[PDB]
Amino acid sequence: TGHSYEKYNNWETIEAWTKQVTSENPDLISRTAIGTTFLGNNIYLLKVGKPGPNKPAIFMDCGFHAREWISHAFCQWFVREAVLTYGYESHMTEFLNKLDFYVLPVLNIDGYIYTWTKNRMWRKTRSTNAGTTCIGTDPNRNFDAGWCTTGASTDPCDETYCGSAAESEKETKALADFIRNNLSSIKAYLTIHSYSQMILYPYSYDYKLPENNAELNNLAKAAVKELATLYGTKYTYGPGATTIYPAAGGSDDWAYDQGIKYSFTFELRDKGRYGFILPESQIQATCEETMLAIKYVTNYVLGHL
Numbered sequence: 001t002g003h004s005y006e007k008y009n010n011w012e013t014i015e016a017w018t019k020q021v022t023s024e025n026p027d028l029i030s031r032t033a034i035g036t037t038f039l040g041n042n043i044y045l046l047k048v049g050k051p052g053p054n055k056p057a058i059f060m061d062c063g064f065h066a067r068e069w070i071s072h073a074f075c076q077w078f079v080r081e082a083v084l085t086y087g088y089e090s091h092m093t094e095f096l097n098k099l100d101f102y103v104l105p106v107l108n109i110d111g112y113i114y115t116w117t118k119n120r121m122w123r124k125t126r127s128t129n130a131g132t133t134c135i136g137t138d139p140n141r142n143f144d145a146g147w148c149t150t151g152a153s154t155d156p157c158d159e160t161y162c163g164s165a166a167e168s169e170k171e172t173k174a175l176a177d178f179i180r181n182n183l184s185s186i187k188a189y190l191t192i193h194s195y196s197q198m199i200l201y202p203y204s205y206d207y208k209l210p211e212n213n214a215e216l217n218n219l220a221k222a223a224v225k226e227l228a229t230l231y232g233t234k235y236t237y238g239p240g241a242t243t244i245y246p247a248a249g250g251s252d253d254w255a256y257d258q259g260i261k262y263s264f265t266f267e268l269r270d271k272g273r274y275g276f277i278l279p280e281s282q283i284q285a286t287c288e289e290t291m292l293a294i295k296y297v298t299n300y301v302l303g304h305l
């Protein structure tokens, strides 16, 4: 149960960590719960930044999908990085002074616990579905963005099940609610996933392109270029629909349609050699290079407020 930044941590440890890291940095972090999961776990949210009046914000979540362990690891890495370098590294110092980072460590807590106890490859939530033994909804197919029109299954037995309705899951309803309640400050939305090594932006529910797609393409291009500087890791980027494939009900498209102009889905290491079972030996190299892209994007957004 002891926490480590170079190891995958179970929920009990991550929860204890959210409490301790907040206790150790009261001037930089405040913890809050934005909802409760289907099984009663608390969906924590860390507000990282120097407190001040009416600051803009960047929202970043991890752990949408249970099996994507590197995602959960990154949110934790990001927070230590933030508090450890504030006051010493100019860029991070300026970010924390000017804006707040809303870090959601693990969204799909129930599914994450399940990967630790019964099925390492679980993806969905763990809610029950009427008229069947099949469990869970794909949280990334449960948002009100062309809900369940494509790339999503209507069968609860499938891994991409869209749900009984948009925001049917307490997790996604809690996330949508928080965001809806803070639209005035949230300038960018970053949702962390694995694996594939990619940076995607809207849209996925449709082949139509976002108004600022050229700006988003330049941004994604610059960010993957910055990420490659550390270890040479190659990322690709583009609109979801054409780069990956059409998939409705994603949070990146939803957030964008709420007015959040900078919205990205990150696909972390690797390309498939280890896939979802990325070795703990790769946690630091992955989080470090990923830090470069996130910080690049943060500086861009700040310069365009």
Ligand SMILES: N=C(N)Nc1ccc(Cl)c([C@@H](CS)C(=O)O)c1
Residues within 6 Å of the ligand: 065, 140, 193, 194, 196, 200, 204, 205, 240, 244, 246, 247, 248, 249, 250, 251, 252, 253, 265, 267
């Ligand atoms: N709205 C979307 N479908 N966004 C989106 C973009 C790229 C990728 Cl890789 C995904 C994956 C993440 S596992 C997924 O949820 O299937 C979703």
Ligand SMILES: [Zn+2]
Residues within 6 Å of the ligand: 064, 065, 068, 193, 194
């Ligand atoms: Zn995912």
